[PDB]
Amino acid sequence: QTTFTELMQQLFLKLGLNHQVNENDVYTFEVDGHIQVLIACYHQQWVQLFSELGADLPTNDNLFGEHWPAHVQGRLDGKSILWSQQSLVGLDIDEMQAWLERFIDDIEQRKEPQNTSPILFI
Amino acid sequence: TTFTELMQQLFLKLGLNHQVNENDVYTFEVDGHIQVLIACYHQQWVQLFSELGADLPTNDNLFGEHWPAHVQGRLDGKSILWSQQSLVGLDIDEMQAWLERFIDDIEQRKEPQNTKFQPNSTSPILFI
Numbered sequence: 265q266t267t268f269t270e271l272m273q274q275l276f277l278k279l280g281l282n283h284q285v286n287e288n289d290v291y292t293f294e295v296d297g298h299i300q301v302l303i304a305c306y307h308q309q310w311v312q313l314f315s316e317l318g319a320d321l322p323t324n325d326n327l328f329g330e331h332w333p334a335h336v337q338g339r340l341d342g343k344s345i346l347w348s349q350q351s352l353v354g355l356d357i358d359e360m361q362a363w364l365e366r367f368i369d370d371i372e373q374r375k376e377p378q379n380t381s382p383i384l385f386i
Numbered sequence: 387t388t389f390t391e392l393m394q395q396l397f398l399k400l401g402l403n404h405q406v407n408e409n410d411v412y413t414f415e416v417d418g419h420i421q422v423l424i425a426c427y428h429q430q431w432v433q434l435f436s437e438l439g440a441d442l443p444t445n446d447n448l449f450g451e452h453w454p455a456h457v458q459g460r461l462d463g464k465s466i467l468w469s470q471q472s473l474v475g476l477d478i479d480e481m482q483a484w485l486e487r488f489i490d491d492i493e494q495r496k497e498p499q500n501t502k503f504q505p506n507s508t509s510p511i512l513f514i
C-alpha cells in the first residue's frame with residue numbers, strides 16, 4: 265500500500281520541478297502566474313491540493329461536475345482559495361500529475377478571466 | 387466494490403429490496419423533510435446531493451470540517467449540499483458513516499440559527 269510520501273517523492277522526481285517540502289511534510293511549488301500549489305495529506309488518507317488565489321473573486325456556485333474531483337472555491341482571510349481533494353487509496357502517479365495540471369489550468373483561468381458548457385452532466 | 391454492489395450492501399443494512407443499476411440515481415428518503423440523492427459518476431465517483439431549501443448565507447466552503455468535505459453549492463438561486471469520494475477503497479461501513487455525517491449536516495444547516503451569517507474563516511487552521 266503506497267504512502268503519501270512515496271507517491272509525492274515519485275511524482276516530483278517525474279516532474280523535475282523546484283519545490284519545497286515543509287517540516288509538516290506539506291509539498292509546495294510555484295509556477296508562472298504567481299501560482300503556488302500546496303499538496304497535503306490528512307491522516308494518511310485524504311490528499312488535498314490548495315492554492316491561495318490572491319484576490320476575493322466572484323462567489324462561485326461551487327457545483328460538482330466540472331472537474332473530477334471537484335475544484336472548490338472557498339474563502340479564507342478575506343480572499344479566494346481553490347482546493348480539491350481525493351482519497352490516497354488508488355491515487356496513482358498519472359492521476360496526480362493530470363490532477364495537478366487541470367488544477368493549475370483552472371487557477372490560471374480564474375485569476376485571469378479576460379483571456380482570448382452551460383450544462384453539467386452525470 | 388461496484389456501485390451496484392455497494393448499494394445492495396446498503397439495502398441489506400437498511401432492510402430494503404430495491405434495484406439500483408450502475409447509472410441510476412437513488413433517492414434516499416430520510417424525512418418527509420430530507421432526501422439525499424446518491425449517484426455514481428463514470429463508475430468511479432460516489433456523489434451525495436441534497437437541496438437545502440433556502441438561499442443561505444455564503445459558506446466559506448473550506449475542507450477540513452468533514453472527510454470528505456461537505457460543500458455548499460448554489461443551484462437555481464438556492465443552496466444545495468454535496469459530498470463526493472472515489473469508489474475505490476470505499477466500503478459499506480464508511481458509506482453508512484458518511485451518509486450519517488451528511489444527513490446530520492443537512493439537518494443542522496436547515497435550522498433557523500444558520501439563517502444568520504457566520505464569522506469569516508481565518509488562518510492559521512490546524513487540522514488535528
Ligand SMILES: [Cl-]
Nearest residue numbers: 279364365368
Ligand atoms: Cl505540472
Ligand SMILES: [Cl-]
Nearest residue numbers: 440495496497
Ligand atoms: Cl433554512
